[PDB]
Symmetry: C5
Subunit: 326 residues, 5 copies
Amino acid sequence: ADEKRLLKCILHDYDTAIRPVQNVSDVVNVALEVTVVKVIDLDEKEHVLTTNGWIYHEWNDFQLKWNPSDYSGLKKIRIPVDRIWTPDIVLFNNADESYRYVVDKLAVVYYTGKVMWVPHARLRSFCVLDLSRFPFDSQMCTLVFGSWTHDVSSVNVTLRNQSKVQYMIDGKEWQVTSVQPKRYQWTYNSNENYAGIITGIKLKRTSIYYQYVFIMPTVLLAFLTLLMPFIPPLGKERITYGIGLVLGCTLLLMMLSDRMPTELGNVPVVAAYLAYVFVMVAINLLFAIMAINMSMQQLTRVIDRLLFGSFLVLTVVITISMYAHY
Amino acid sequence: ADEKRLLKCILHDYDTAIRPVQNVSDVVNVALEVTVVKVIDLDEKEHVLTTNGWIYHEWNDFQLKWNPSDYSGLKKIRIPVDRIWTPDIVLFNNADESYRYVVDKLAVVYYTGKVMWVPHARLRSFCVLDLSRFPFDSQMCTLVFGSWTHDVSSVNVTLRNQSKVQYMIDGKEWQVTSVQPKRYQWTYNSNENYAGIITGIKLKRTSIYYQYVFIMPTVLLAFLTLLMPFIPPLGKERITYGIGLVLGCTLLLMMLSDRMPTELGNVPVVAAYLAYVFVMVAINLLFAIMAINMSMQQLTRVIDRLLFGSFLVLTVVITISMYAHY
Amino acid sequence: ADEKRLLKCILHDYDTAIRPVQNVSDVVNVALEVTVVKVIDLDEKEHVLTTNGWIYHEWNDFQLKWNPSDYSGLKKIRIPVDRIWTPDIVLFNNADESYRYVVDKLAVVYYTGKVMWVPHARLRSFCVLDLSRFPFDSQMCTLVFGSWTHDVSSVNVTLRNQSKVQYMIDGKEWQVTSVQPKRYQWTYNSNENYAGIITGIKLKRTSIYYQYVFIMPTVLLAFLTLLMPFIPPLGKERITYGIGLVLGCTLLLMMLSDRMPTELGNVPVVAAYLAYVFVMVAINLLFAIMAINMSMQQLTRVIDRLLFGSFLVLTVVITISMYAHY
Amino acid sequence: ADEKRLLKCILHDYDTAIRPVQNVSDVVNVALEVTVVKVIDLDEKEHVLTTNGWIYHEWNDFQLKWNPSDYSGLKKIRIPVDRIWTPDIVLFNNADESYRYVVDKLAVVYYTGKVMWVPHARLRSFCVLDLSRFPFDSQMCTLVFGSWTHDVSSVNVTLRNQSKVQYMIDGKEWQVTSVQPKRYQWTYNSNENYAGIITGIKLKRTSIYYQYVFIMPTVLLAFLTLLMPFIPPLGKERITYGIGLVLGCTLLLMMLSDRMPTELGNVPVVAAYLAYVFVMVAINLLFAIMAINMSMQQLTRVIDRLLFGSFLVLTVVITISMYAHY
Amino acid sequence: ADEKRLLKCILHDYDTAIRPVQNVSDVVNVALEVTVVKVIDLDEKEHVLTTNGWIYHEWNDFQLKWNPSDYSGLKKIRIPVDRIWTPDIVLFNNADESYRYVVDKLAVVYYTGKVMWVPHARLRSFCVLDLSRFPFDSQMCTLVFGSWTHDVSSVNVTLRNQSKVQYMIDGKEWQVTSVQPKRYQWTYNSNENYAGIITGIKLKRTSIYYQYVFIMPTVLLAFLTLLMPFIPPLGKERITYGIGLVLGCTLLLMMLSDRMPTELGNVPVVAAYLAYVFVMVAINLLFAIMAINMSMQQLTRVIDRLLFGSFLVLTVVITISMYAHY
Ligand SMILES: *[C@@H]1O[C@H](CO)[C@@H](O)[C@H](O)[C@H]1NC(C)=O
Ligand SMILES: *[C@@H]1O[C@H](CO)[C@@H](O)[C@H](O)[C@H]1NC(C)=O
Ligand SMILES: *[C@@H]1O[C@H](CO)[C@@H](O)[C@H](O)[C@H]1NC(C)=O
Ligand SMILES: *[C@@H]1O[C@H](CO)[C@@H](O)[C@H](O)[C@H]1NC(C)=O
Ligand SMILES: *[C@@H]1O[C@H](CO)[C@@H](O)[C@H](O)[C@H]1NC(C)=O
């Protein structure tokens, strides 16, 4: 067949390690575009972002050149990348042992020498996230692609400006929206430059899981702690009520500590609210113990009334602040 | 032997990367049928479906052509796929790093050129599931198979209409039933088309695990919360009973939050019932605290009677609604 | 040396994909015997059985044939399986991504053409288990070995009847005993037959872990629930005692739900006993609340006496039934 | 260079599968010595021992023979094992899917034909452990190395008696000391013998983790249970104290069951002590309930005094026995 | 092209296993420098340090030698390491099964024969850590690189003194600072020396996670235990308050035991503080039980006053000591 003829012709002496430049003072312009098809997860416990997508490679191999008229058309031809040269472009913030692709067995080569690859992949990428508004947090995770072997004088990583589009994924957790990728240049020993593309995706947590697990038991334990100072001290049920709030808030803290990551810069607002509720139970237990201590003078109810007034107004302020965060 | 003769004959110049078309404007029709032998698990915590089954490949390789009379019969012959051409057909929603097969070492080739492969595999597939009726939920998970390298003008993925059958698996968890697969066409840059088969399987959770773990302690804690307002307030056991319900419902919430996934769109009905029970304990604690607060006028029992009446009728309505869900 | 001479002689034109039959209407009889050396674990949470053992292959390769007198003896010779033909026999219920062996680098070939392989392996096998008597359960897990590529007309999987022996392993968990393997024939599209061996091993759980963790706290919480109705109602300690049983039985339920698998057909007897204890605490709390409700007529002790009598006799019946299960 | 000359000379016709014997009735003596550099962990939950060390291979390859005077010295030469013959010696109790080495890329070959390998490795080995003295337990785990392909008539596994040394590792968990390795011979079908070395290492748990987590809360809950019968029954705080001990001992039991393995032969002494404390709380709750039951004759304090006396003397006996275990 | 000419010239007879020395009594000086770009995690539960960085190899291959004037410049050339010799330098304390690189597909070779490699990698390294000041602990973890095959007489591992720089990473967990690497020489059978570089990095935990999870509930439970002896004994709420502290401190202990590793040498200060709080609750429960025991002479308040005085002054001493640790 004619498809075997050009394949045996233009791969008769091809070496997969030779950089395809006609002159020694020349580079190859490798065009990249990462496109996410599905954001799988954002594991903040280990600061990884698991995602699925395809990275569009496009370079210009001048050694694979022919005219279609000698082969009766056939502009497109498909070669595995194990027999042609490929640029070593990997993630700059890879979060696993080795970088592997889902499909990497074919690459489209045109008659003008330009080569497309498009290997689909599952990318685990490190991305910095600040949990100062957990779980009502808007995020931004970056994927950095580039060459760690070839410098700028060997290859040139270029974004494609012909498709300056933006896309969105309406996940049930994250309302993922994309940011226009840019090129940022990393140096090496202040002489050699190692270029690379950077692509941000702006995650936005729209969750009903973390609200139901963390927001509503914390505000209801706050409600019970506010209901506590109407209990009269001379029956001996206020102290066991307070220690029940202590145990329930300890269980809620253990929930939160199981879910909140170690890799933490600032305290989340749900954690600060839970700490406020926990120390509020402590202060109310102090007031109950003092009240029953001098109950053995009996004009205690105005102290509990002003304590409920202060805790009511400050709890309304704190809850309104957390609602303004949401 | 004669089996070596045709193998050395029709693989004397075979290239595994050449697409087997006689004309350049021709495609190869690859027939697919996925068949599940056992659905292993549906991990909704990570939205994956682990299953075991074999995917039936069938294409037409015109380069492997011979007559049996020159080889004294032997219509069937078995070649490993590492020496012949195979289509790059993978899952469109694969949920692991790389796509691998359990057995992929043989493929049946006939004298008419048609090639069967049948590689058995363990497929981890992403599938969307809405847990609005957990755990009495009927589901539907899809397996999408197709080529991410060859377009429609190179290969053509075709369902086989000769076997339009349906099957079922009677698992102890899922009553798995199958749906007639169809073909859905995915586009690429609005010019190149990338076809593929889609196969739905309709899962149905028939579980006694999640009922015993979640349904019966929630309804029994509801029963205890309904029994609560018959306790007289002037003994100081109602408040510790209410905080015991608070701690028990917190433990049940921690059970549920351990089992309910983060990847959540809507709240499950067991979660809504547990939240209703938890806020019912909150309202009953408010009423008990108010009652013992003005116990220091003594006609409290009619308020507790009407409170039990309202909680009884609304609890019967909610439990009847959850039973109508089941 | 003479060992290289026959190796270069009878592998001078050997193809590893040719099925070794002299006539086209002939099969090769591959003799199998799986032998377990150690049953590692039975993970019922994922329905897998991890085991270690060697599978004894034995077939008849007529292409490796020589007389010892031309090579001065040397009946035994050892060839890696990468250079000779091997049958593609795998597990029919494999529970991992790919089937791999611990040692697969040598195979013994005799002068009569018969070939032994014996690759040792760690097998993860799916096996159906019914937990209707957890944890006093006698089990049976099956290992099915066969070819998914070669049919009956290509290879023939045969058990060896020369060694019809039975063995046993005295593990600290499982008293593992073996069952005589048999041959069961699986069909494919009702025309092609795909044979295979099946080997059952009869596990028997003899555990002191699950007894100490689950049986004794459940029966002691039953003992405390039986001790509950001797508490007089007019002191207000019966209700907090009952809610303490509620919280303790909730903790025990959370233990059991952590250990009991999701993949569940029937409720275990320890789970049914725990549910019975939990609803017994519910009924006793109902009776205590009613008693203290009409304590505000004072002839309550006969009701508690008959309640203890009914709960005593039915608890003795249930505990005797669970002991008869053991 | 001269280093390439002998490498091309004595590997000009080398086959990596030929067993290096001049006569057919001859074996090769492969000398083994495993040396542990660091014991990583002893996971008793899965009965594995993770360790790091190098296994010293030494055999006599008569096919790699030369005199140094023809190559101007160069007695030592270094060949990768992929081009020379190596004996297939693996662990007899391997605890992973496949046996792999950390470094296996070089092997030292001398001019006398003797070959050293020394591949460093991370070994996961099954070893039997009896937890009858957890966590004050002295242990012994074995590493068995041998050939599962070559029998005694092919290779001969030999310990080296020139280095009959013993070593020790002072870990913060295990005071690891080594035992002089010996040779134990395993049979196969009572005709073929499969030899192998066995090496015991005597672990000794010197832990402050398991003491602080398990020993001190159990003995302090024992202390609280002993303090319980001084509470007078006519205040209704003894029953809630006893149910608080029930809940605390249930939490401690859940700690222990999370840490104690399923793979259990005998109950640990900490588990027996916790069960004794738990049933002691049960007996004390029975005595408190009986006392408050006939409190409605008032000479109860001598019964509580003799009960404290019996529980004191038997608790001192049990604690002295557990201290004598330590 | 000219780039293929020298590649075919100086690799026309290259063997990848020959050590590149002109004389037999010569070594190759391999220059190493590990550089960390990001410290991923320090898992003290398994004593591993996961990090990302590149290790700078530099050796002198005299077999790859040419002048640029015969090839019109081109001093730099890039060869994959699979076709040239590379030194077998691995981690001496590797914490996984096999040592693999993220990128290892290229290596820069100059016209003077010196070869750079720079493979980026994710290193899991064992490092000793003493948790005597958890979580306010300054740490030091070491990475040891060297050859386990080539001795000092074959290769020579050398640090590069031209870059004696120090760097720092401002993580949200660890304020990572680097230490000047040195060379330490390991012996083998007291005759052969096996050199290697060692590089320390000085970690410093600056966390708000472990403080909020462990420090504040322990000090607040200490605060509640200090508030306990103002409760009058003749109401029967002191004992249930003490058992509530017992249950809350048990939950906090279970938090800590879940987070504190088994691999423990000394008790952490948070663990010692929690044990002190737990035994303080025990002593206060003893004093409350004694007080209510002889309440049935009534001058008890001075004993509780001196007990609060002693517990106040010793708690201030302990908390001031833990603050001086911080
Ligand atoms: C790489 O391509 C960009 C595209 O604009 C260009 O600006 C830059 O100079 C190029 N780098 C080179 C030629 O080294
Ligand atoms: C692929 O096969 C289907 C089968 O009906 C056909 O409808 C479709 O046109 C084919 N696609 C081509 C030929 O591009
Ligand atoms: C396979 O071997 C068994 C052994 O008895 C025999 O019964 C069966 O007929 C054989 N199958 C064939 C020859 O297809
Ligand atoms: C293997 O070596 C040991 C070393 O003493 C020897 O006793 C034994 O007989 C040898 N086995 C043979 C030669 O089969
Ligand atoms: C290795 O290099 C160091 C660098 O100073 C040198 O001191 C040492 O002697 C060398 N080792 C040899 C030549 O064996």
